Amino acid sequence: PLSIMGLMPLTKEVAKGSIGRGVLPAVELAIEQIRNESLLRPYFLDLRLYDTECDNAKGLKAFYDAIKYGPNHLMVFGGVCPSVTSIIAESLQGWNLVQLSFAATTPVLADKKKYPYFFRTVPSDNAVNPAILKLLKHYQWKRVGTLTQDVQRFSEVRNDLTGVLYGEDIEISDTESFSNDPCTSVKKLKGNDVRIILGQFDQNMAAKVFCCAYEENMYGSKYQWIIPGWYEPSWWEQVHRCLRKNLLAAMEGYIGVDFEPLSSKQIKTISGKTPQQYEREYNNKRSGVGPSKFHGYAYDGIWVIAKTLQRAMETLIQDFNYTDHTLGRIILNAMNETNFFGVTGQVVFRNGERMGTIKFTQFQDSREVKVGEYNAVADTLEIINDTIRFQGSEPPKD
Amino acid sequence: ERRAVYIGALFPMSGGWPGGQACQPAVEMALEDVNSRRDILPDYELKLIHHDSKCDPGQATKYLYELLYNDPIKIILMPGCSSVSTLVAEAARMWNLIVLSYGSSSPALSNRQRFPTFFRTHPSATLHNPTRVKLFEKWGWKKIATIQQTTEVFTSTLDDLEERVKEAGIEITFRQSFFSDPAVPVKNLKRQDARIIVGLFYETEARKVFCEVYKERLFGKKYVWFLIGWYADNWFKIYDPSINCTVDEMTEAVEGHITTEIVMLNPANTRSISNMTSQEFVEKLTKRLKRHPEETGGFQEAPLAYDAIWALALALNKTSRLEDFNYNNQTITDQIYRAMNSSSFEGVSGHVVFDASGSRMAWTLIEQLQGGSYKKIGYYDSTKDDLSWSKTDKWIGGSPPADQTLVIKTFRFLSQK
Lengths: 398, 417
Ligand SMILES: NC[C@H](CC(=O)O)c1ccc(Cl)cc1
Fold this sequence. Notes:
This is part of a larger assembly, with chains A and B.
Chain A: E1 2-8, H1 17-37, E2 45-51, H2 56-68, E3 75-78, H3 82-91, E4 98-101, E5 118-120, H4 129-139, E6 143-149, H5 152-164, E7 171-178, H6 183-190, E8 196-200, H7 203-215, E9 224-226, H8 244-250, E10 255-259, H9 275-285, H10 295-314, H11 325-335, E11 339-342, E12 345-350, E13 353-354, E14 357-364, E15 367-375, E16 380-382
Helix pairs in contact in A: 1-10, 2-3, 7-8, 10-11
Chain B: E1 3-10, H1 20-36, E2 44-51, H2 57-68, E3 74-78, H3 82-91, E4 98-101, E5 118-120, H4 128-139, E6 143-149, H5 152-165, E7 171-178, H6 183-191, E8 196-200, H7 203-216, E9 224-228, H8 247-253, E10 258-262, H9 278-288, H10 302-319, H11 331-341, E11 344-347, E12 350-353, E13 363-369, E14 374-381, E15 386-387
Parallel strand pairs in B: 1-2, 1-3, 3-4, 4-5, 6-7, 6-8, 8-9, 9-10
Antiparallel strand pairs in B: 10-13, 11-12, 13-14, 14-15
Helix pairs in contact in B: 1-10, 2-3, 4-5, 6-7, 7-8, 10-11
The structure holds baclofen.
GO molecular function, one term (chain B): protein heterodimerization activity
Protein name (chain B): Gamma-aminobutyric acid type B receptor subunit 1
Organism (chain B): Homo sapiens (Human)
């Protein structure tokens, strides 16, 4: 029995419970396959699920109860909402526990001096900066402007972007930031002849930004917008200043950037299957539960946990009463060594951060379509032709 | 013979704000003074169980677990800085506990629908904002910049400063934020030509901010910095291995910056409920300390801890019932909540009242660094609109600088020769 502490919103009352309920089939498949093939020969993986409704109070209560009443847990697995995830991840080191998340995408968790024991199988949303760098190098865009909403996540994404570009020859002409209304800032962007704009703002502020861009005439054949792509699908007509035709005319052609759910290769993964077969069996396993985006990352996370427990038992003393510093260090050093082809690509960690594939999508007439990928392990950007298009003949130049 | 009742506490002895060093002996003094008196609790006894939270939510989480899951049942917790206070106050509704802070100034902790059982003796940090707006209006500045750290206390202070400053016709042109590294926002401030800068960050981080300011030459005759007056008096001369800028460079990197702080101590010489004036309190505290007051962190917040302990004791006396308290029922905790909500007594830091707005103090001290030392340059009372200006502030050139130097319509005249 190798007990694992599973924290994720399973409650129906919370909106984020959809993530846990759609992820559970994937983790079930992974653990049942591990039990069948018997990777851990004498032991067996015991995943204990503790429900956290993304309330900091209830999440901390569940964590405390699992620490005291539950078995001796070796690791923590899960953490979907950012508040509870931050609370647990900062404090893990006190109990020598090691966390592996699959939904916590905030870039602040990448600080390995405040979160030394935190790991991620999902690319954080500040890992889209080298993807944007390769996209800029692909079209010879050597002068960009930025429009950043002033909260923590976007500020950190921008403070990382400015360091990614350091050494290259892409200069940030103008830098802007707003808090409540971006209209004052789009005017300053227009008044400096900024052609390529890297926006880091929220979903509710995106509608305002695009309305202010339509009013400022910051669109058409000679302007390009590159905004985040994790917005929910059909996020424009859900809003109800500018009537929808102008909003759509202002946002036609923006390139979203986001991580990719599943791989597109056919090479056999560590499970002995291909990503297409895994997706087929996942879709026929869950009957009516809503499909989540993190099911592949949960499959890979369970396989990472199994492999790291295996290679930690290889170097072995085994008891864990939350006092064993040595066992925590052994599990850390074993998790740092994870390298295998999972269902979402190759699973490699660079200081706790997963090196995955970032996909590009472009808003055509009334829907977003995929227009390329960026493989961060090989550092290669491939743009799917026949898909990406521009309103002018050539790409807009700065 | 007396049934002991226990309180939990978390004193930050290090980190962002090391207030525990001088707020823990104050709590010891207050507990001794309230246990010696037979009028307050004739049959109970207030005892303290404390831990050094170091002012970070990780060790605070560990010690909160050790507190809530150990031998003595606690009736109230007393966290320190704003981070630990927010964590405990939003986690304490599951165990039905009351949280009473003494040094927590986060404006976000005034939300009753989010921190339902939270009290504090420290004023909210929204009091610095009207003083800043008054200093902007006096000197005629209309567009300012900000460089904060993304902690909830500074975010809330900046939001309130925003809705304040927008009300008087002044705009914040540039907003920068950073989590642990200020180099990029500092160089973005330099590249954007910002003149009047409001920095909202802790001291151990102000040192890094100002190292990066020195390396960017973002100081001199054109720039004015508005910091927080709660840092140590020699915070720029303190040796710090994380920064590369030496002491002599940093001493001139920060020169002529304005700071604001609240008084926190009763200026009058009347006697409080403990039968002790502010001078005797300060003298006993100084005799109780191990180092000098100027180098002991959190000396200006010790009366707040004293008054917090006294208010807790008075509210427990008003109900006088205690050993029947467990983390499950809601009767005793909301009884104590109703008792504390209606507290009013003359403490060593003025009239102690637990209001929702968190602003029971009025006077704001305004200072300025002149030649490596702080000199007081005024006072301000936000309610009666009083500005006791002392006419002492110095400037390079006799007059305070101005941002965005204005255009001058100079005429061309026929040569007179
Ligand atoms: N009592 C002072 C208060 C403590 C806190 O907010 O945790 C404080 C606020 C802000 C700063 Cl920069 C330094 C200290």
